[PDB]
Amino acid sequence: TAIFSDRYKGQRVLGKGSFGEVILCKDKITGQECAVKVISKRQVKQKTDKESLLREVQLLKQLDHPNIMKLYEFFEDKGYFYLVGEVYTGGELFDEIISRKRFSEVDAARIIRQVLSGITYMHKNKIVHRDLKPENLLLESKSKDANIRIIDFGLSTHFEASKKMKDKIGTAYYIAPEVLHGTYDEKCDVWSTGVILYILLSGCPPFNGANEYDILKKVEKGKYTFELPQWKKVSESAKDLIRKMLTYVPSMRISARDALDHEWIQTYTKEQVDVPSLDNAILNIRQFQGTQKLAQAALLYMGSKLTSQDETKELTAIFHKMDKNGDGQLDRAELIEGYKELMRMKGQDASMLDASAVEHEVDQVLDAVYIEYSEFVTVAMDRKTLLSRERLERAFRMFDSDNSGKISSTELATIFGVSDVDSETWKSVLSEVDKNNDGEVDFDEFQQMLLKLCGN
Ligand SMILES: CC(C)(C)n1nc(Cc2cccc(Cl)c2)c2c(N)ncnc21
Numbered sequence: 001t002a003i004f005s006d007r008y009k010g011q012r013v014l015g016k017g018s019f020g021e022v023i024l025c026k027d028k029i030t031g032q033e034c035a036v037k038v039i040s041k042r043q044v045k046q047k048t049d050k051e052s053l054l055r056e057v058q059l060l061k062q063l064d065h066p067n068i069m070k071l072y073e074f075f076e077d078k079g080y081f082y083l084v085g086e087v088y089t090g091g092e093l094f095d096e097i098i099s100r101k102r103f104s105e106v107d108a109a110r111i112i113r114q115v116l117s118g119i120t121y122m123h124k125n126k127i128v129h130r131d132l133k134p135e136n137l138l139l140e141s142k143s144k145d146a147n148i149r150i151i152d153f154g155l156s157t158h159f160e161a162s163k164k165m166k167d168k169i170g171t172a173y174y175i176a177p178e179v180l181h182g183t184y185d186e187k188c189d190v191w192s193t194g195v196i197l198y199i200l201l202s203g204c205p206p207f208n209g210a211n212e213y214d215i216l217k218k219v220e221k222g223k224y225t226f227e228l229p230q231w232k233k234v235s236e237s238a239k240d241l242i243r244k245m246l247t248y249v250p251s252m253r254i255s256a257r258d259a260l261d262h263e264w265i266q267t268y269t270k271e272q273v274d275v276p277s278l279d280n281a282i283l284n285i286r287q288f289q290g291t292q293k294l295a296q297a298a299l300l301y302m303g304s305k306l307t308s309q310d311e312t313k314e315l316t317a318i319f320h321k322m323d324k325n326g327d328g329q330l331d332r333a334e335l336i337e338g339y340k341e342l343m344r345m346k347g348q349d350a351s352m353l354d355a356s357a358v359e360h361e362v363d364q365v366l367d368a369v370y371i372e373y374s375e376f377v378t379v380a381m382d383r384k385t386l387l388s389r390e391r392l393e394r395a396f397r398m399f400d401s402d403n404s405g406k407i408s409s410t411e412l413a414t415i416f417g418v419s420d421v422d423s424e425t426w427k428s429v430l431s432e433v434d435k436n437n438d439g440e441v442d443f444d445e446f447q448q449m450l451l452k453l454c455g456n
């Protein structure tokens with residue numbers, strides 16, 4: 001009965017999350033800011049019935065913990081679900097860790113005590129995460145004392161995971177083996193935290209591989225080691241906690257509660273022995289984060305380019321039919337009607353919450369441009385891809401940490417492995433872009449490879 005757009009207005013896009021886009025919204029009466037996840041019913045399948053989802057939402061709204069995201073409201077219309085909750089502005093935990101100069105076991109213990117405190121609380125209330133990963137650890141604010149907030153607790157129980165690689169980047173590292181075969185319980189969150197902790201103290205995933213399926217093979221076997229030089233400077237109690245958290249049989253695996261009482265958490269979170277900086281771990285987390293973000297940006301660039309081609313042609317045909325005399329020009333109200341018609345057929349955009357948002361977007365394009373609708377189409381569609389094109393170059397620049405301007409063949413293999421692009425498929429594309437290749441590409445050659453890898 002209650003309508004989302006009657007209460008909230010979209011201010012700006014915050015980013016892509018599991019199951020949908022996240023928009024910064026504001027209450028039209030009280031002025032309260034909130035983060036809203038818009039889940040498209042067409043793109044996301046429900047695992048449970050409507051009554052099971054409503055009962056979990058009602059429970060989730062009443063729960064409260066300092067390391068769990070607060071949910072405020074829930075709305076549903078014919079095509080979408082709107083999960084309304086608190087905004088966090090500190091960004092992802094790993095993007096903050098790589099910005100600092102020193103990082104020790106004391107810092108890793110403070111991080112993992114918070115995550116475990118949050119998990120322990122949600123497990124007492126019979127809610128499992130299942131998809132716990134570093135990307136779901138947000139920092140409350142930009143300050144250095146910011147608490148960690150776990151996002152998306154309980155959503156995997158009600159919404160089916162996407163099968164598209166652009167949505168699955170980095171999920172294989174943290175997923176518990178029992179989730180892969182179907183019988184799982186809340187212990188799968190201890191395993192995921194165990195993996196996160198292993199990466200905090202070494203900067204390398206315990207179960208790794210050249211592609212998604214090779215990682216899942218390592219996870220399913222469950223075998224890993226502490227045989228990297230960097231593990232020599234780490235305490236034995238940290239290694240003990242990891243062994244208990246990455247125990248294969250879930251009934252033998254330590255609980256979230258007992259992980260808090262472990263010697264490592266008790267010792268390294270108290271204010272009262274020597275603790276050095278894990279320099280090799282920071283460098284490995286910075287290289288790991290750069291790689292994951294470039295693979296993700298490459299996949300989102302290709303996805304936006306295909307979506308842009310579909311919408312450019314659809315919008316061009318809508319305006320062509322609306323052109324009565326055939327002079328190639330239309331009025332403002334016509335362009336609004338046609339642009340609204342694009343969202344009616346292709347589905348409402350997360351940034352275009354209602355007619356007023358569409359009218360403002362049309363006005364923003366008309367400020368750049370009886371008007372030539374082909375010029376309106378070009379500008380409107382280039383504005384939709386702007387964020388994905390700029391995010392690609394920024395991620396290439398961040399990955400190119402030595403500012404050489406190029407990435408090597410070994411780095412391309414790693415990037416395309418995380419992106420799940422077949423080895424022979426990208427090597428074939430490189431040869432068509434630059435026939436006299438020397439085992440390295442610059443940004444334009446890399447973007448040219450991606451354009452070819454999505455039919456251009
Ligand atoms: C993916 C990004 C990082 C953009 N994101 N995701 C979230 C989590 C979220 C946001 C709204 C609803 C739900 Cl169910 C989950 C969120 C939040 N709270 N505050 C700021 N940004 C957020």
Ligand SMILES: [Ca+2]
Pocket residue numbers: 400401402403404405406407
């Ligand atoms: Ca370089």
